[PDB]
Each structure stands twice: as C-alpha cells, then as structure tokens.
C-alpha cells in the first residue's frame, strides 16, 4: 500500500512537470528568437551588405536548423513521457490484479 | 515607440495572459482533486460506521442468547425463540454478502 | 526597452509557485490513497471473519 | 519622482503580513478539524457501546 501511493504521487507530478517544461520551452524559444534578431540587429556597422548577411545568419542558422532540432528534442520528451505513463498504468493493473487474486483465494 | 508598442504590447503581454491562464487551470484542477479526495474519505468513513452498526446488531442478539443459556434449560421457549431470531439475523446478514 | 531580465525572473517566480504546490500536494494525495487501500483491507478482513463465524 | 523602490518594498511588507498570517492560521484550523473528527468518533463509539448494552 505504500508504493501503491508512491506510484500515483509520482505520476501526478510527472504529468504536471511535463506541461511545466513545455511552458519553459515556449518561453525559451521566443527568447532565443529575440536574442537572435538582436544579435542580427547591431550588424549595421557595415553598409547594406552587412545588414543582409547578418539576417542571412539569423534566418539560415537558427531559423533553418536550430528550431527544428528543438522541436525534435521536444518530440522525444513527449514520447518518453507517454511511455513512462504507460508503464505506470501497467503497474496499476498488476497491483490490482494481484490484490484481487489474493482476496478471492482468501474467500475460497 | 515602435519597439515598445510592437514587442511588449504585441507579444509579451498576451504570453503573460497565457501563462496566467495555465496557472488558473492548474489551480482549478488541483482544487477539484482536493474536493474528490474529500468525497472519498467521507464515503469510506460512512461505509465503515454502517458496517459497525450492522455487526453490533448481531452482537446484541448473540450476547442475549448467551445469557439466556444460563437458566440451565434447554427447553426454554424464550431460548428457542431467541435462537430462531439469531438464525434469521445471520441469514439476512449473509444474504447481504 | 525590453525588460527581459525582469520578465524572466517573473516567470521564474510564477513557475516556482506551481512547483512548490505540486510538490506539497501530490505526497499528501498519495498518503490518502494508501490510507484508503488500508481501510479497504481492514474492512475486507473484518467482514470476512464475521461471515465465516456466522 | 517615481519612488518605485520604496513602492515595491512597501508591497513586499504588505504581502509578507498576509503570508505570515495565512501560514499561522491554516495549521491551527486543520488541528481544530482533526479534533472535531476525533471527538465525533469517540462519541460514536460511546453511544454505540451504550446502545448495544441496553
């Protein structure tokens, strides 16, 4: 009965902290956007060439490769979260079937 | 003023509202969990107390027949009738299970 | 013009609220679940013993 | 011209008041609720025992 409660207790915390890390991620992405376009902002020390080559870096490096990698890492987080929740749900079934199996035999 | 009215006024403040909304939703959900646990505890307590009462009802007739033993009469109609009472009591309790 | 430091620290406090409350809540919820199962088992034993006597 | 430091520190003290009092209050309220349920249970047992004797 102790670990029976420990399971649910960890499960609820897992479900909460998944969305809390999701919120952290969305707060992080637009921060990185602002930082990227701000690093690309002060590249006006050159002429019009230095402008477009700075926005080329901002739009090809971060906008081209970094953000989908962030999405991919997020996807793996989602998948692992789902898998572990399934493991929890399976262990629930296990415990309850064991308890029923015992009580029936007690009655018999 | 373009920066002040496009960055903060355009994106930051609705993000603050969105974070606030999630806070509200989680607050409501956890309060609902609390309210559910309340129901759980109180239903469990009532379920126990009712069974306690049902047991003590049988215990009453049991002790009654026990002191009806000590007349040293096996042919006492009081004793026979109290036994009939206890039999039907046990039948009605077992039928409930 | 973009107080992003203050913004992030605000978000930190906001998140830290919910962290603390989830942390405090779920433990006690699990304690409740344990006590519920324990009372269930006691109930089963008591009723079983009574029925077997009867 | 905008004493915002002093403003915020005032708000800090004001909030800290209510934090401390909520903290002190709710614990004792829960203690009361516990004692109420305990007295209820004692009452139930005593009355039950009397009735079963009678």
Author numbering:
A (entry chain C): 142 to 249
B (entry chain B): 196 to 292
C (entry chain B), D (entry chain A): 34 to 87
What does the paper say about this structure?
E. coli cytolysin A (ClyA), also known as hemolysin (HlyE) or silent hemolysin A (SheA), belongs to the α-PFT class. ClyA is a 34 kDa soluble monomer, containing mainly α-helices with only one β-tongue that transforms into α-helical elements in the pore complexes. Each protomer in the ClyA pore complexes is composed of five α-helices, namely αA1, αB, αC, αF, and αG. Here we report the cryo-EM structures of ClyA pore complexes in the presence of n-Dodecyl-β-D-Maltoside (DDM) as dodecamer, tridecamer, and tetradecamer at the resolution of 2.8 Å, 3.2 Å and 4.3 Å, respectively.
With the data from sample #3, we were able to observe not only the tridecamer in addition to the dodecamer but also a new oligomer with 14-fold symmetry. Final 3D reconstruction resulted in EM density maps of the dodecamer, the tridecamer and the tetradecamer at the resolution of 2.8 Å, 3.2 Å and 4.3 Å, respectively. Although the tetradecamer map was resolved at a relatively low resolution, the model was still built based on the dodecamer structure model with identical protomer fold and inspection of the electron microscopy density maps for assignment of bulky residues. The inner diameters near the extracellular edge of the pore are 70, 72 and 77 Å for the dodecamer, the tridecamer, and the tetradecamer, respectively.
